[PDB]
Structure formats: structure tokens, C-alpha cells
Design a protein around this ligand. Sequence first.
Ligand SMILES: CC1(C)O[C@H]2[C@H](O)CN(CCCCCCn3cc(CNC(=O)c4ccc(S(N)(=O)=O)cc4)nn3)C[C@@H]2O1
Ligand SMILES: [Zn+2]
Length: 258
Amino acid sequence: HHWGYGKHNGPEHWHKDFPIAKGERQSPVDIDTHTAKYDPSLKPLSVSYDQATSLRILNNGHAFNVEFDDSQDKAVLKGGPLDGTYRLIQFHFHWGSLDGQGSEHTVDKKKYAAELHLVHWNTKYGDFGKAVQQPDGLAVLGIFLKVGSAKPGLQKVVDVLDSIKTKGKSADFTNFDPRGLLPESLDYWTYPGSLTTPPLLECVTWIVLKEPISVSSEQVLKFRKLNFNGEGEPEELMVDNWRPAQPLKNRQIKASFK
Ligand SMILES: CC1(C)O[C@H]2[C@H](O)CN(CCCCCCn3cc(CNC(=O)c4ccc(S(N)(=O)=O)cc4)nn3)C[C@@H]2O1
Ligand SMILES: [Zn+2]
């Protein structure tokens, strides 16, 4: 009876094994655009992905992760609200069964079709497992997806999904350039929060870009043909793998832009 996104093991149940689910800095949240304050002391984000080394793509039973070599400073996030250097370890998405839902963050209660999370860890803690025990251990860059025109830089991901349909399957995924997933503008909102899946640790600086990327209906349909189940188990489509918005509590969301 492991956690997931079903009726019996979904987000409303997670607090029974992970009591931090009801904590003071949980993610995701609704971003109220009228309440977020412009912070002129924030810096432009520095997204340095030109030396990124992708390795593998894995269906882990709740999403698919594209994994990177983080054994040196190759793909890093710096600046904005961050102190020091955060290394890219993996990206993954959260998506819906229909285009009207799927994102984890919301914007004035608007749900997007999906949400990309680029996950980075603070190199002053030495490894990812040490970084998730610290309040400034991770930085997650969140990017909304809307359905419209295809995203050319997503198609290499879309075309490998048939090879990792079920839980525990992986495939080589070298020479993927994550710069092809970025929007034009790096304007963002930022707040302190958490991992959005168990163990829900309160270790994340969230950086959520204002500008969504556009993907095609055919691209998101391929995400929705993945399975939560293992091979030779009853088929359960991998859809609606998103946590809903959590209470903001004693937090302020800051905007990088006027
Ligand atoms: C195994 C590998 C290559 O994959 C990276 C994955 O992000 C996580 N691996 C397992 C870490 C082992 C103990 C550390 C604590 N921890 C981490 C995890 C896995 N969860 C997570 O790492 C996680 C990351 C991001 C997010 S979100 N949706 O962006 O907020 C949510 C969760 N489970 N327990 C470390 C990884 O290195
Ligand atoms: Zn995520």
C-alpha cells in the first residue's frame, strides 16, 4: 500500500506515512499574481546548460526522469534568489488526463496542462542525499506547459517514451540539450517550499517561470500513454500525477519582474 495518485493512495493520504505533508512550507502553491511582490533585490537567473551531460531516462512508477551527470559543475543554476551553485541532477514532468489540469503550481487558480521540474542541488552539501536534509539544499525550476504548437526540443523525449512504458524500465538518453525546453523569458516567481512527492522534504527554493512553453496535443497524448504499473501488471495509465496546491501559511511569493 505504497503512495501514488489513486483514490486509495493519493495526495490526501500521504500525511499518514509522511506527516510533513501538513507542514509549514509545503509545495506546490497557488501563485496569486496581484499579491506577489516585485523584489528589485533579486538577480537575473543564470541558467548555464551548454555543457549538460544527459545519461538515461527512467520510468519510476510516478513520472519519467531524464538523469544527468552531476559528478562535476556541467549544467548549473545560479543567481536569482540563490546563494552559490546548484547542479542539474534530473528533470521530469507532471501532467493531466485532460488539457484543463496537470500542473502542480497554479496562477490565479489557473491549472496548466503540465509542469516541467528541472531539479538542482546545492554543491556546498557535497551530494544530493545531504542536500535534501537542508532548507537551502535544492532549487527546482518550474515551467508550465500549455497545449498549442509543438515544442521541437521536446520531441526527442516524446519519441523514447514507447521504450519505457512501464515502471522500472530505462533507456539510454545521451546528448539531450535541456535548453530546448526553456521559454524566451526567464521572468519568475520564487518562494521557499518542498518536494511535491514523498518524502515531501522542506528543502526547495522554488523558481517558477511566468512564460509557459507550448507543446502539441500529440506530444502530451504520448505522455498519457505511459503506465504507472510494471510490465505484466494491470494497465493503469500514467495521468494526473500532480499534487494540488497547499496552504501558503507564513510565506511570501516574490516576483523578479514589475
Ligand atoms: C537516483 C538519482 C540518479 O535520481 C535523483 C532523484 O531526484 C532522487 N534519488 C534518490 C535519493 C535518495 C534519499 C534522498 C531523499 N529522497 C529523495 C527521493 C526522491 N525524490 C526526489 O528526489 C524528488 C525530487 C524532486 C521533486 S519535485 N516534484 O521536483 O518537487 C520531488 C522529489 N526520495 N527520497 C537521488 C537521484 O539520484
Ligand atoms: Zn516534480
